[PDB]
Amino acid sequence: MILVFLGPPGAGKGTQAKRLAKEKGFVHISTGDILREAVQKGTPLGKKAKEYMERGELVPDDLIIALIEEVFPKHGNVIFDGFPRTVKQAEALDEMLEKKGLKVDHVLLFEVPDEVVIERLSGRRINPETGEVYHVKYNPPPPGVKVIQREDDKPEVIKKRLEVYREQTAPLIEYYKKKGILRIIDASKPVEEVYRQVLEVIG
Ligand SMILES: Nc1ncnc2c1ncn2[C@@H]1O[C@H](COP(=O)(O)OP(=O)(O)O)[C@@H](O)[C@H]1O
Ligand SMILES: Nc1ncnc2c1ncn2[C@@H]1O[C@H](COP(=O)(O)OP(=O)(O)O)[C@@H](O)[C@H]1O
């Protein structure tokens, strides 16, 4: 089963993907996580992507399409988390899947208001060592766990990321509606409740 998680930054896509991957057996592909690793390792991809990421802009399509091809599994259960983010990316994904004899089975839209995701992003914290994601209110780190705030989780960058989502990524909702595989998740609820919706959609 191939899943696409679509929705604004901070909707909880990574959080749901990690739990679903562990409990139900999916490979989790997060373009955000992979890009951040590239920046940290100072690869040619990382050095180019950094400037876009830090300003809340999308990384150019050709770079992202290559990234995904590099980590594409042969078949089986996959969650695409934060990919595609543009129509060109969605077209490219369809092509990649086709050449592997695969197709997108469900696109889950994580529907949630901007005020909800602003609080989620502003309070998001990461353990730079384990990569585990926390939230200063909704999932605080335990005593003794050092965390950091991502550079792109600052207020002006959150604003830009949401504008970019509405401009370039939101059109994918109707792209996938036309194909008849879009399913709406209410992502404004607590983690367990969103997870049960995800499981209800995919069975
Ligand atoms: N599919 C993609 N296309 C273009 N840029 C991307 C893509 N995925 C991630 N990025 C870049 O990485 C940043 C953070 O990725 P994102 O998916 O928002 O991860 P997170 O939601 O955990 O912040 C984006 O704002 C953008 O700069
Ligand atoms: N349902 C939820 N309710 C409250 N906070 C959440 C929920 N899901 C995730 N979070 C927190 O919100 C932030 C964003 O979650 P994340 O999974 O990184 O979103 P995305 O991958 O869509 O950007 C994180 O700090 C996370 O701990």
CATH number of the domain where residue 106 is located: 3.40.50.300
In total, how many domains does the chain have? 1
CA-closest candidate to residue 169, choices 56, 75, 19, 18 = 56
CA-closest candidate to residue 114, choices 12, 11, 198, 32 = 11
Other CB atoms within 10 Å distance of the CB of residue 44: 9
Q: Dihedral, CA atoms, 100, 103, 109, 110, nearest 10 degrees? A: -40
CA-closest candidate to residue 79, choices 11, 16, 35 = 16
Task: Report how far residue 133's alpha carbon sits from residue 41's, in angstroms, rounded to the nearest whole number.
Answer: 20
Is 59 annotated as ligand-binding? yes
Mutate to test the pocket of ligand 1, among 55, 59, 125 (most ligand atoms within 8 A of CB): 59
**Is the shortest distance between the CB of 31 and ligand 2 below 6 Å?**
no
**Is the shortest distance between the CB of 8 and ligand 2 below 6 Å?**
no
Catalogue the active-site residues.
13, 85, 124, 150, 161
Query: Which tokens hold the place of 4?
Result: 């696409």
Q: Are 172 and 108 in contact (CB under 8 A)?
A: no
Element (H, E) at 45: helix 44-55
**58 by DSSP, 3-state: which?**
coil
Is 57 annotated as ligand-binding? yes
- Per the structure, the complete domain to which residue 56 belongs is given by 1-203
For residue 120, give the ligand 2 atom closest to its CA: 12
Q: What is the resolution in angstroms?
A: 1.6
108 phi and psi, to 5 degrees? -100, 115
The label of the residue with tokens 């069975």 reads 203
Strands across the sheet with 2-6, in order?
Answer: 27-30, 78-81, 2-6, 106-111, 182-186
Q: How far is CA 91 from CA 58, 87, 174, 176, in A?
A: 17, 6, 14, 11
State the burial class of residue 127 (Cβ atoms within 10 Å of its Cβ: 0-12, 13-18, 19+): middle
The label of the residue with tokens 């609080």 reads 119
Distance 168 CA to ligand 1 centre (A): 12
Ligand nearest 10 Cα, by number? 2
- The length of the chain, given as a count of residues: 203
